[PDB]
Symmetry: C2
């Protein structure tokens, strides 16, 4: 192990740069040369690979996004396309590749490992979802969680006193953790997640039953996995009156400076990814499980939801 | 268990109100009456106890500080004084007391348990330190961590291009986690903590050795446990020239809206504290250990430092 590459792939998340920075510095510290792959797996084909120095990742820990870019490369689902990528790395003496992104990102990294016993592959969970196996938390969750708090607080502050219903869409893809954690945190009355059977009757039954009962605003956080915010405001008229702010947060959730939580988390897993390459390991996803940094096979990673915390969230809304 | 009291005690931390809110709501949910003790243990003597309704803790999750106040009550170190406190609770039918604060706060709660087998006591770690046993993290750490990031980012942005040294004092009392976590996160070159022998020669040896080597600013984070920021700027002239921003962050670190991390954490432990009272337990501190919510005896609580992460922090500064 003397030449490592690194890419970022899929929807961007806060701390991606922190993660890269950690890989670069750790590797270089261990007298390993490091190559920045630009535009995700697209760049891996386009041969958009470039050596990185210590200074190449100066003034990035705090950076939102990814400075190596990310692409969508659906064509990478094809052995024959992948053969080109593999060569681009194979021609430059790169024996290891690190990959920062979703469980999607991980896929192609597993492919490369299977399809080339030379190139070691390692996966780092740079994503907002929280939806990766073998990690309690992913890089971007905490930041996203705080973005939503922040956005929610704004809507409150910029709204008039009439609208007493904020139907807020959180970006979980198929995992309700963000919505749960953000719901709890903003004192949402109702939280709508894939993992719990959503009783819209009961939900309006509780807005009606506490807002002609004299509070200031009620908020409904919604996991995008469950439904759109427009779908829920439709679904909620069909019992009671609410036609008030339906906020579709979206991609702002992916921007912004990572929080402390993600900077450290990213840094730790970027370092650990490099160690594992030095220790000759391959095709694993790193993460944090039971406050221990760990590695988990892409096998196990492809082959959960705190209903207690959900139940608690509800216990805490009057 | 039908009457519970709750207080906040010691230096205030973000999420204290969240914690209270959780106790109140959970208790009431379980048809337990709940009494707000005002001004810490002082109020416990002064008999400044007052029933709390669901609405008494509306619009508090996000609140910085504590709305029941906190006092310093050194006199509480005296059996005879405590006898009064105990009676105040004992006269109103309160069989359980919940206490949100430092390991100091916990002390007197253990006393009360020993000194009155009627009153169940439970401790919740509302503090910035991280310095309580049987919890990986305390309520306020994450917020503090992010405050420091934020403060550090400001100083940067409001400084001129000359001063290339920011000697920043972080509030850990005797524990270097904040300084470590904040140092890492702001890309500090040097981190000064109680737990590592601090080689001031080597430190300036590295500012001198990278700043006439052409970077923009270097930052030194300092655990207040180790030394003052003024002491370190003195200690650092005594080899090399630096007479640049020595920022003494202080009590701002204790203000501000808890982050998501602490709102959830607080909420979870406030709920769990109430459960444990219902389950007839006593004289335990709750916390989160290995991503499991747990309880730990005040015994064990009175009878650690990731040098690997410290070592990593350094690996990542050029």
């Amino acid at each position: 192990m003397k030449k490592i590459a690194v890419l970022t792939s899929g929807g961007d998340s806060p701390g991606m740069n922190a993660a890269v920075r950690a890989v670069v510095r750790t590797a270089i510290y261990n007298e390993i040369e490091v190559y920045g792959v630009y535009h995700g797996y697209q760049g891996l084909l386009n041969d958009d690979i470039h050596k990185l120095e210590l200074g190449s990742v100066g003034d990035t820990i705090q950076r939102g996004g990814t400075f190596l870019y990310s692409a969508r490369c659906p064509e990478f689902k094809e052995q024959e396309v992948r053969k080109v990528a593999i060569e681009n790395l194979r021609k430059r003496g790169i024996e290891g590749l690190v990959v920062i992104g979703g469980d999607g990102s991980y896929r192609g990294a597993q492919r490369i490992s299977e399809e080339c016993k030379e190139i070691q592959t390692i996966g780092i969970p740079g994503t907002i979802d929280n939806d990766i196996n073998g990690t309690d938390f992913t890089i971007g969750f905490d930041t996203a969680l705080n973005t939503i708090i922040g956005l929610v607080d704004k809507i409150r502050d910029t709204a008039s006193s009439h609208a007493r219903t904020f139907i807020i869409e959180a970006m979980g893809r198929d995992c309700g953790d963000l919505a749960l954690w953000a719901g709890l945190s903003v004192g949402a009355e109702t939280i709508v997640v894939p993992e719990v059977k959503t009783d819209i009757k009961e939900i309006a039954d509780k807005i009606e039953q506490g807002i002609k009962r004299g509070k200031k605003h009620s908020i409904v956080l919604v996991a995008e996995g469950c439904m759109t915010a427009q779908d829920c405001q439709k679904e909620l008229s069909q019992y009671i009156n609410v036609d008030n702010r339906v906020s579709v947060l979206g991609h702002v959730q992916r921007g912004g400076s990572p929080t402390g939580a993600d900077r450290v988390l990213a840094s730790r897993l970027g370092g650990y990814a490099v160690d594992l390459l030095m220790q000759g390991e391959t095709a694993k996803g790193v993460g944090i499980k039971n406050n221990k940094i760990v590695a988990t096979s892409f096998d196990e990673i492809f082959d959960k939801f705190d209903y207690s915390l959900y139940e608690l969230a509800n216990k805490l809304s009057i």
